């Protein structure tokens, strides 16, 4: 169960004038922060969201995000004007890090334009992606001339980001290592043809996302189980569905088993 910090940003430019920049942070599966265009700050969503930072240290970071939001919009509007780019612009940034035992850490800063990867931060500078729409190289030229921004991104990713993750893990063990027991139930599925009929397995309300779901006739699991996506609940937890088509006869006296962290060894067994 990995806990990387993913700082996600959505910057939408409709016109040369209309602009909206919004963000959010995830410590693994959990959403830790919110960044609304309307607000002058990054909203802390959990009682441990500030990590082991002081209010002043947290204010220093708050300042970096205000200047960055302002500057990023100014810089995009300038690049559009310069590089002659049609104004419905969709820019996305994904940054953060994941810390591992032995003080080891890997960081990243990726930028996408119109849903496609254009550049990223690699060590000390900005590098374009393999499919570089050429204007990106002109952008890189300009961007890499700012040794202050490059020095500041290194500080944030190589220094402050691992510090923030380590602080958050220490602060929120209570909610991060928490477990919530799910609830499973049997349901009737639609017939894809005549004799054939698909069977559905429902599991909902488990907090730590890693889970294993499989259909079984006994001690041997049955191959043909097509599970859906692990869909989220607003109620913090997750929901999962699993479909299996049978020739009607291979449905009588059917069993099921679901393995999860919450259940104290004994797996939830569902029967007809």
């Amino acid at each position, epitope marked *: 169960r990995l806990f990387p910090l993913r700082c996600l940003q959505i910057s939408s430019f409709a016109n040369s004038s209309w602009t909206r920049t919004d963000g959010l942070a995830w410590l693994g599966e959990l959403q830790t922060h919110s960044w609304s265009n309307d607000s002058d700050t990054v909203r802390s969503l959990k009682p441990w969201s500030q990590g082991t930072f*002081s209010d002043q*240290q947290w*204010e*220093t970071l708050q300042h*970096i995000f205000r200047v960055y939001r302002s500057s990023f919009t100014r810089d995009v509007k300038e690049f559009a004007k310069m590089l002659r780019l049609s104004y419905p612009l969709e820019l996305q940034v994904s940054a953060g890090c994941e810390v591992h035992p032995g003080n080891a850490s890997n960081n990243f800063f990726h930028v996408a334009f119109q849903g496609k990867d254009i550049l990223s931060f690699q060590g000390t500078s900005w590098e374009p992606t393999q499919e570089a729409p050429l204007w990106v190289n002109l952008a890189i030229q300009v961007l890499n001339q700012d040794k*202050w921004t490059r020095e500041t991104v290194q500080w944030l990713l190589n220094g402050t980001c691992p510090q923030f993750v380590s602080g958050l893990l220490e602060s929120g063990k209570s909610e991060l290592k928490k477990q919530v027991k799910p609830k499973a139930w049997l349901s009737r599925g639609p017939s894809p043809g005549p004799g054939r009929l698909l069977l559905v397995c429902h599991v909902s309300g488990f907090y730590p996302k890693p889970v294993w779901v499989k259909w079984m006739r006994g001690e041997q699991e049955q191959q043909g189980t097509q599970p859906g996506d692990i869909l989220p609940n607003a109620d913090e937890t997750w929901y999962l569905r699993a479909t299996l088509d049978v020739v009607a006869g291979e449905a009588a006296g059917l069993s099921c088993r679901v393995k999860h962290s919450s259940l104290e060894g004994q797996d939830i067994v569902l029967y007809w």
Partner: T-cell receptor
Amino acid sequence: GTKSVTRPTRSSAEITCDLTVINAFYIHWYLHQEGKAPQRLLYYDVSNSKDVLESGLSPGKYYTHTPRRWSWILILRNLIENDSGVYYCATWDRGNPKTHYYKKLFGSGTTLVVTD
Amino acid sequence: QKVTQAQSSVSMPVRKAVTLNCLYETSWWSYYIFWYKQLPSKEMIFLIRQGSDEQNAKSGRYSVNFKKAAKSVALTISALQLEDSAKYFCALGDPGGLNTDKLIFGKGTRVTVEP
């Protein structure tokens, strides 16, 4: 060169900033008392005209006045003996040697002497 | 956040070198150290900046010997001049890369350049 401002207790002093900052964002005020380490008391956010005070300092005590552009004045109310010292204003500049990084540039300093 | 400069006074002859020791405490994984020079006129002059993730800094006759593990930033003035006699302050940034940041200073060391 360093100035001096002599004032009686229970009165107020005006420490004028020695720096000329063309694109000022933040003006920091430091107090250096003989034998102690220089410490910043507050900084003034030029854009939002706001004083940000260090923890432990009472609001009202310090106020950065800006009578005009590129001019800053630190006003101290209710002077006492412990207010005496050398007062500097500062900015992150990059600079006389012109570097990629900012270094903190300090004014000449104003020596506050609180008599009685 | 704390900065200590154990040396109150130091005397060294002209043309020789002097190592001004400093020990700090920081609540930042990545920070910057700055060395300042105070003249008898109370004027504060910036000499050199260090920085945790950087190599040992050198700017003219100023050189920083940065031992990150022990948290030491010993400044060395190599070919002393008479004009070098002043109060040298060691400042730790909080963190020292943003225009809102503060500097945490040591109490200062006074160098007395012997003619």
